[PDB]
Design a protein around this ligand. Structure first.
Ligand SMILES: C[S@@+](CC[C@H](N)C(=O)[O-])C[C@H]1O[C@@H](n2cnc3c(N)ncnc32)[C@H](O)[C@@H]1O
Ligand SMILES: C[S@@+](CC[C@H](N)C(=O)[O-])C[C@H]1O[C@@H](n2cnc3c(N)ncnc32)[C@H](O)[C@@H]1O
Ligand SMILES: C[S@@+](CC[C@H](N)C(=O)[O-])C[C@H]1O[C@@H](n2cnc3c(N)ncnc32)[C@H](O)[C@@H]1O
Ligand SMILES: C[S@@+](CC[C@H](N)C(=O)[O-])C[C@H]1O[C@@H](n2cnc3c(N)ncnc32)[C@H](O)[C@@H]1O
Ligand SMILES: C/C=C/[C@H]1Oc2c(-c3ccccc3)c[nH]c(=O)c2[C@H]2[C@@H]1CCC[C@@H]2C
Ligand SMILES: C/C=C/[C@H]1Oc2c(-c3ccccc3)c[nH]c(=O)c2[C@H]2[C@@H]1CCC[C@@H]2C
Ligand SMILES: [Cl-]
Ligand SMILES: [Cl-]
Ligand code: NA
Ligand code: NA
Lengths: 389, 389, 389, 389
């Protein structure tokens, strides 16, 4: 029986996933995608490319209606009629949306054609994660839709400049993304919520802090950790959580509006909030770790170099710059780390960097790689520890 | 070990797939997608929705460059630099595009970082399938992009009008989709290539022609089969191919430009090409089968009703209207027959219809369902045979 | 490919096995055996029945030669010629024996045709497990060999008498098995080594000692636990190990030679060794638990009844008889608790007993079942707690 | 759920088996056995070695009762009581036998504790296959039970002589097996039925007969095929079936009592029955193929050499000797071909031979290997074609 074999496949894959860890499960999920692409028919490939786009649009509609948050708190299955009346949606529109959502597990449909939350419905109800999907719809989609004709019109140039990429055609502006987004309210509110989505796991999973400290001393009043562009300060919070009695200042540096947003969730003491533009010289001198997580990936090498050069003069012999960012391999890179590369090229003019490309960039700033501590698999995120040359 | 487990999963799924038939393989691929969605983390969900739409943009770039047809005819692996200089692409851009395409199997990367065609490469080199991908990019994506705000602005109506749906916002026009397309030369050219893609399997695999015919006589000059909106006439070709000695006229009906495009690939005898607009009265009287394949799905009930009412008066007691189209189930409908529903709502104001919905629509035309012959699984396509009430 | 499929099956089963517990692994191994029997051809069936018994003969040869203990302590692979000359075996015979043992995993053959220990090699080097294999060869096989003609000659009786079953034909004696063994020195020596094999898990993993005890008081000198036929006293040892501060005498009862063999491995204090024949009245009065592990299974109902009737008069209202033994299900019983049934019918005139059969036997002794605490799965071993009626 | 995972394992293994061919299924079955041995606990290993012997004894009882043939023709499940009364067996003995048989799939037990035939019950009802199991019980078992103490008493000699092996101790005789069996009636009747069990597949599956013929001519009256020790003549029957109009005599040679037994099932013409002792010179001169299937494996090299030397003088330049027999590999030999080696060493003093050992034996007879045509996998049976040197 085909159905019996399909059910047994699901049982065995679920059991294998449940027994391994998060990295093993991520490897299984990539394998399932690889198998799907290898087994689909030519017509299936075109159908998948035609229709998988609709998930983001329909997730946007569900978020506009508040469907996912409502469904995630319901204690019993709900009919399409009940959901439509409660959320203020046309009854047959609601039924068609739910049918589509159930077919891509954005909700679950029951045997009496009612609806309950799935793992994805819960995810889309979380404000920082819902903001990621809304960001894909309103910011990434227009840039991806502009890039084929941008490249055609310009005879397929190598994109190297944040002010000359697809973003400018998509949003009909001459400034780079970061400035243009400075001026748009709805954009900024969603961006704001995006900063609250903390990624797991983080570099402290694998970072051998005591080993990297060596005999460095916090006396008299030195800084252990300067989180440059630290956003809501998640790195600082987790550092103090895991090393609560390690001496030394822990300093969150960002722009004033972001630090004001961070105060609500920062600890009452132990973490300093210091306004600092990372395009200016670093004010904290001789810190042990100058930390840049998911900062440099957003800049082409000219601008990423200048961010590092503003830090290097503050370093003493024991100081390290810690770049925590994607480190895709030379070959066999996965879709999450090559898709990111196409999107940041499109929007920001920047790129993902292999380990060799990170080392070449850091060498231009007078820096040498001392250690690399991977903390995610199979997609590579790592804390790279750089010394003065 | 993790790598060993993952490779073993792929070996076993590949072996199970190779041993079933096309419908079994489609069930396996549906299960692999559901497993992927159930096993992904919340961050995975957002990254998948953020990045999967980039595949359509990058397939459109590869199509613009001629990359897939070139790779498909290459006899050895090609370096990124060879492809870049052959195709007129910047070398760094080409390398980044190929890394991304290899990660989603749109090409294959070798272990010395050269590139060869995949199944997907070959698919995207086929003119009609390439055109389906290009249609997704240039026609489906803008309407999906406009749908959320269109729904919000209009307070979530039940869309029933081809001249009042998301299409009008997306392309800033008051025309309905079909009329507007007819004014756009590049778009109509790509649609004509799309008509050359023949779906498989087809209704003749399960349609019991002999039993439906009974003692039906073709004399003096009656038609056995009238293919209304038949495009390239693939249904007429396959009919004549399978039943070459069955008497009766076989008539392809479409608008003049499509009939002209069809002449190259039609048989020299046995199939008549008859210009006919299906919004006007059917000229062929008393035919055995009036055949509508993937036609009525593109019209709201009002207009689909009118198309049937243009045929009904031409029928005698033995005539049948055969609707060959999607018949999704009442529950558990699959993504390829619910995502279509959302797309055709947004572009055409139309919908997919369950069996009960087809029968209700046909009853307003004075017709009753005699038989239903499914020929695809698990996504339902069927030949629905209707007679006068 | 066939080889690839086969290796993938083994990878996936090994991964599933490693992730469950011992009971899950036992269920998997039962399923593998049932799959093997359902998939074998008719000729396979006969070859399996023809050849699988050779493994006991060749394990007995390896034991005679000392091969398994020698291989288990070897630090590198050994050639057949090295093993032959070390162990005193003809070189061709040794090579043929090793080829056979490698094909059933009793050793492992390397790719340069040398030999190393397997899990099974290590098992057969353990004195008590070696003795179980030697017992199968010298005691179980002759009785199984005599059973078919014994049944035929006697017109298929229901065997109920330890002095009238297949044992008497197999060893050409009128004695019952236990008495005859006691006259055979080599056999009794191997049985004494067999007593050193401690089964795991044991009843204390699920026995709720505190709840069964209640407010039971040990003073002035009552016994908490009387281990009747306790062998090496493993139940007493594990009892004292798990509940070292529970007051009350713990008493191992067995015949003098077994108590003497037990002295080496008993604790120096806390467990009394008391010579007692369980076919005679129980000397310890009013103990909390009189414990019979794998005792009553070796006696037909008449004699098992007598053993219980020798204990009952020693009981007070708080005393319990704990029968720790196999409790096979009414249906779906597994091969390891039905093959035992056939063996003990043939050698001892005994039987395995379902829960209902245990309760019927205990009721003739005046006892009622209070509780049943299973501690192995899927083959059922349980501690059955009986009180006076 | 453990049960759910176990059920899914069975479903997936059954589906993989059902889709491959008989050789793929034989590889899967060997893998399942390998997994069982690797996953069992030390106690399980001893239990399996103690109890798997009982299958042959209980199969013997079932055959004595006629249970398997009766159950194989029953049209509905039968209770233990019904079977006991019909077959003349004690009711509780019958119930215990059926419980054991169901646990090793020798029958199947239903959910209402009744019994139906399994694949193994059908196999054991077939007279030639039942005779193989009875042969294992009455002929192979006594020799395997004698071999450990035979080897111990004789200080582990290399066994090379049919008149000095374990057989002589097992059956208290000084003659080799073949003569001693000449004198025992029950033995001979069962042996007789054994000859009717035709193995599948056979060498004609893969033997390129037309290629091996070359330009050999049957004119005037030459023999195509001389089946030496051909038993019931199955090789001759299948040769004429697959090559019904190939010219040349086809001759079955055996001892007179076997050829009289073969007449009932030989074709009415086309196959000659010729009495011939293969220890005498071959009377048919210049045949194309002199065929020896499963003959030489039963003889030590001295006697196997003399059988070949009696054929060689009859050969002309185009004649071939075809040895069809087991050809185990140099390493990694499977249990069916190494267990056979131990049993024929025990009973007959002979051995399985690798390809190199066959070539060494044939070279002593003046013969050279021309071709080897395997026809079973993974256990190697092959037709080896030898020429004059
Ligand atoms: C990817 S986000 C947050 C990255 C942060 N390290 C983390 O892991 O959450 C980039 C951060 O850089 C900050 N940022 C952007 N421009 C900056 C500038 N010129 N100076 C300092 N911070 C800046 C943003 O405000 C935001 O908090
Ligand atoms: C989705 S295509 C289907 C073609 C065909 N039934 C098949 O299965 O391939 C729709 C067809 O309808 C035709 N069509 C659109 N409007 C029409 C009209 N007013 N009258 C006749 N044909 C029309 C198009 O030219 C096109 O060939
Ligand atoms: C199967 S062994 C079981 C030992 C112990 N109950 C255990 O679980 O290991 C049976 C034990 O019963 C003992 N036994 C046999 N006959 C006995 C008798 N008449 N009185 C006391 N013990 C006896 C033997 O010496 C042996 O130690
Ligand atoms: C393994 S059995 C049958 C083998 C046969 N080639 C086949 O594949 O069925 C061995 C055969 O050799 C025959 N045989 C034994 N001694 C013989 C002898 N001295 N001369 C001729 N045939 C003999 C037996 O009668 C029996 O038919
Ligand atoms: C020729 C069809 C191409 C694809 O667009 C359509 C259309 C369509 C959409 C916009 C403009 C014109 C027609 C109507 N009706 C369908 O069914 C599909 C499906 C087609 C294939 C992929 C998914 C779509 C929903
Ligand atoms: C100490 C037990 C050894 C094994 O023989 C027995 C015996 C037994 C048999 C013959 C003579 C003396 C005792 C009784 N009662 C059992 O239960 C087992 C099982 C034992 C382990 C393997 C399978 C057997 C049926
Ligand atoms: Cl479809
Ligand atoms: Cl047990
Ligand atoms: Na890339
Ligand atoms: Na061997």
């Amino acid at each position: 029986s085909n159905a019996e074999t399909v059910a047994a496949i699901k049982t065995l894959i679920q059991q294998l996933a449940q027994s391994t860890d998060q990295f093993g499960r991520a490897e299984i999920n990539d394998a399932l995608r690889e198998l799907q692409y290898s087994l689909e028919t030519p017509f299936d490939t075109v159908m998948r490319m035609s229709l998988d786009t609709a998930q983001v649009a329909v997730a946007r509609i569900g978020s506009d209606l508040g469907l996912f948050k409502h469904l995630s708190q319901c204690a019993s299955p709900q009919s399409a009629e009940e959901l439509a009346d409660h959320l203020g949606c046309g009854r047959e529109l609601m039924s068609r949306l739910l049918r589509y959502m159930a077919s891509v597990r954005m909700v679950q449909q029951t045997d009496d054609i009612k609806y309950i939350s799935s793992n994805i419905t819960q995810t889309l109800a979380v404000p920082g994660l819902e903001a990621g999907m809304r960001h894909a719809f309103e910011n990434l989609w227009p840039v991806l839709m502009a890039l084929p004709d941008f490249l055609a019109e310009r005879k397929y140039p190598d994109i190297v400049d944040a002010k000359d990429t697809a973003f400018q055609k998509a949003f009909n502006t001459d400034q780079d993304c970061f400035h243009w987004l400075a001026t748009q309210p709805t954009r900024i509110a969603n961006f704001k919520v995006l900063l609250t989505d903390e990624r797991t796991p983080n570099f402290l999973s694998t970072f051998p802090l005591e080993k990297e400290l060596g005999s460095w001393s916090a006396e008299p009043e030195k800084a252990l950790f300067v989180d440059i562009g630290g956003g809501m300060g998640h790195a600082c919070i987790r550092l103090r959580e895991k090393y609560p009695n390690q001496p030394g200042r822990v300093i969150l540096q960002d722009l004033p509006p972001v630090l004001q947003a961070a105060q609500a969730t920062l600890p009452l003491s132990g973490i300093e909030s210091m306004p600092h533009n990372f395009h200016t010289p670093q004010p904290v001198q001789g810190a042990k770790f100058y930390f840049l997580r998911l900062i440099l990936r957003d800049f082409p090498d000219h601008q990423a170099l200048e961010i590092l050069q503003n830090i290097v003069p503050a370093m003493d012999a024991e100081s390290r710059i810690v770049i925590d960012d994607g480190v895709p391999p030379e070959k066999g890179a996965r879709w999450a780390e090559t898709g990111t590369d196409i999107c940041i090229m499109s929007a920001l003019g920047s790129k993902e960097r292999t380990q060799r490309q990170w080392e070449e960039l850091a060498a231009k700033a007078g820096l040498q790689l001392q250690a690399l501590y991977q903390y995610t698999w199979p997609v590579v995120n790592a804390a790279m520890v750089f010394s003065l040359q």
